[PDB]
């Protein structure tokens, strides 16, 4: 945002005094703007909203539709789960719930786990979901044809380092640099 | 050349040139639809054949065709100036919706072909007339009363209070 | 005092004139119809327009 500094500088035409630009403005006229209804092609349901546009671009298209990209999701209903997307600890219900939720939260694993329903299904950590998603993607790749454990070691190493009591933090960090 | 200062009251329209000490043209903001279209100066005289509408209620523009006609009268009759050759300063009640300010800009630039425009809050302009860096402005206008606190010329929108009695309903009482 | 200190009289920066035909910066001014212009094509167009205007009026 800012750090409490001078105000922004904005474009202006009527610097000087509209005696300079009297001619440059009088000789031209504006393109007629209109409040026009539009429907974004990115909308699965064809709802319509208003906004200001030039009345020569009316109803053309919504430039932000190109931001509507989505990441893929695997598919299985009756037999692909048993044949290819096999599992022995996760039910079809839990896998489908996790997959729909991952689409909800666009494979943002942390908030995915945050939502992961702990009372419709048994508890588990983020890296379990991450590695299971990797496994399902690998299986899909095979039919359609770095290490989670070290990440757990990560979480525990950071937890130990930070939970370290302040005096030990200072002493060890001294010991850290001395050698 | 000069900038046009058109103040759109709630029943009283004030107009003039930038730098003048007083609004040369003052005419009631009346518009009448026969039983053509006429604005206060002639409308107030033509009542017998006319039905009188007000385009500004409580400082917020009611409908835009009548206000269009008010501005047309202002310029072409009262001021005789060409809108295409003068910058226009418009004043609107505090707490005017965004759509209303946008429509005011649209009407000015499109219909009246003004080269340069500005919309300023009436209370801040009254403070400018008073000449104080910070203040609280009690503006019992033509159709609504507004209490506007201003710090360093910046109107604090959250604190602005509207009470819906003023000169007109007072006259009714 | 006024003779020696007239002072005041702001300079009043001029108007950046434009050519009506090509909307280019103006560098000429037609003695008849002091409309500014920038090209010779603009000049003949301006003179034709003045002829039509005076015919109409």
């Amino acid at each position: 945002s800012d750090k409490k500094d001078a105000p922004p500088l904005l474009p202006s035409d009527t610097g000087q005094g509209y005696r300079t630009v009297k001619a440059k403005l009088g000789s031209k006229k504006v393109r007629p703007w209109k409040w026009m209804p539009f429907t974004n092609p990115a909308r699965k349901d064809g709802a319509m909203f208003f906004h200001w546009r030039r009345a020569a671009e009316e109803g053309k298209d919504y430039p932000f539709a190109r931001f509507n990209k989505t990441v893929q999701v695997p598919v299985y209903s009756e037999q692909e789960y048993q044949l290819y997307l096999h599992d022995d600890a996760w039910t079809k219900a839990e896998t489908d719930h996790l997959f729909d939720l991952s689409r909800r939260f666009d494979l943002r694993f942390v908030v995915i786990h945050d939502r992961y329903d702990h009372q419709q299904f048994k508890k588990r950590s983020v890296e379990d979901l991450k590695e299971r998603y990797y496994h399902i993607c690998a299986k899909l790749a095979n039919v359609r044809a770095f290490d989670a454990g070290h990440e757990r070691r990560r979480k525990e190493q950071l937890e130990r380092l930070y939970n370290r009591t302040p005096e030990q933090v200072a002493e060890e960090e001294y010991l850290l640099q001395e050698l | 050349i000069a900038a046009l200062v058109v103040d759109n009251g709630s029943g009283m329209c004030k107009a003039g040139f930038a730098g003048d000490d007083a609004p040369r043209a003052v005419f009631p903001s009346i518009v009448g639809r026969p039983r053509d279209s006429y604005v206060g100066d002639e409308a107030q005289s033509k009542r017998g054949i006319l039905t009188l509408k007000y385009p500004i209620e409580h400082g917020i523009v009611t409908n835009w065709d009548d206000m269009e006609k008010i501005w047309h009268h202002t310029f072409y009759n009262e001021l005789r100036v060409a809108p295409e050759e003068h910058p226009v300063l418009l004043t609107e009640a505090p707490l005017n919706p965004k759509a209303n300010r946008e429509k005011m800009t649209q009407i000015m630039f499109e219909t009246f072909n003004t080269p340069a425009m500005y919309v300023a809050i009436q209370a801040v302009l009254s403070l400018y007339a008073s000449g104080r860096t910070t203040g609280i402005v009690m503006d019992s206008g033509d159709g609504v009363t507004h209490t506007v606190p201003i710090y360093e010329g910046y109107a604090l929108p959250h604190a602005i209070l509207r009470l819906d009695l003023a000169g007109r309903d007072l006259t009714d009482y | 005092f006024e003779e020696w200190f007239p002072q005041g009289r702001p300079p009043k920066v001029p108007v950046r004139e434009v050519c009506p035909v090509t909307h280019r910066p103006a560098l000429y001014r037609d003695p008849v119809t002091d409309i500014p212009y920038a090209t010779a094509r603009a000049f003949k167009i301006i003179r034709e327009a003045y002829k039509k205007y005076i015919t109409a009026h």
Binding site: S27, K29, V30, R31 | - | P20, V21, I35, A49
Partner: peptide, 21 residues
């Protein structure tokens, strides 16, 4: 005056000597 003859051009349209009647 320039606009007494001629006619203003919409922004983006190339200037051509459109003339009022």
């Amino acid at each position: 005056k320039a606009s007494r003859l001629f006619q203003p051009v919409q922004y983006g349209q190339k200037p051509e000597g459109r003339t009022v009647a």
